[PDB]
Amino acid sequence: LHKEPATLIKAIDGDTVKKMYKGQPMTFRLLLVDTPEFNEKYGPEASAFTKKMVENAKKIEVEFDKGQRTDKYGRGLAYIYADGKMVNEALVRQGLAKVAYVYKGNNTHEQLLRKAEAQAKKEKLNIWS
Ligand SMILES: Cc1cn([C@H]2C[C@H](OP(=O)(O)O)[C@@H](COP(=O)(O)O)O2)c(=O)[nH]c1=O
Numbered sequence: 001l002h003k004e005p006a007t008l009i010k011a012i013d014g015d016t017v018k019k020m021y022k023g024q025p026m027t028f029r030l031l032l033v034d035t036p037e038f039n040e041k042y043g044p045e046a047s048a049f050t051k052k053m054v055e056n057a058k059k060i061e062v063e064f065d066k067g068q069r070t071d072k073y074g075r076g077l078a079y080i081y082a083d084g085k086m087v088n089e090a091l092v093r094q095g096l097a098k099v100a101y102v103y104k105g106n107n108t109h110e111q112l113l114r115k116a117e118a119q120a121k122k123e124k125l126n127i128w129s
């Protein structure tokens with residue numbers, strides 16, 4: 001995989017972030033994770049965690065996997081990095097996301113995130129408490 005430049009347009013919720021990528025507004029859905037909806041328990045915290053994380057970053061990078069790059073709603077499907085720290089992995093580590101939507105095309109960082117979910121569960125963090 002490789003990291004590509006992008007600039008925040010807007011944080012949306014725990015696992016979707018609108019960015020400008022190669023000149024175009026594009027809504028990104030985070031690969032391999034599922035944050036609760038804003039109206040569910042931990043939703044607002046998931047949204048706020050992702051928001052602070054993308055908003056504080058000086059450098060945002062987008063990383064496509066090997067499978068499909070857009071979902072059926074036209075959302076980019078990526079691993080997202082804030083100053084070199086992967087948001088996807090970071091939500092899971094804090095028990096603000098579950099590992100999810102693991103499809104065959106698109107799972108490079110699957111074990112990494114499951115590793116994080118193991119440690120999150122280990123500590124009864126947010127969702128696991
Ligand atoms: C994360 C992800 C979601 N999706 C689709 C499947 C789900 O379809 P359905 O809407 O038919 O359930 C939806 C879940 O996203 P949200 O969790 O943002 O709702 O997005 C993909 O197709 N590929 C992916 O990698």
Ligand SMILES: [Ca+2]
Nearest residue numbers: 034035036037
């Ligand atoms: Ca979700």
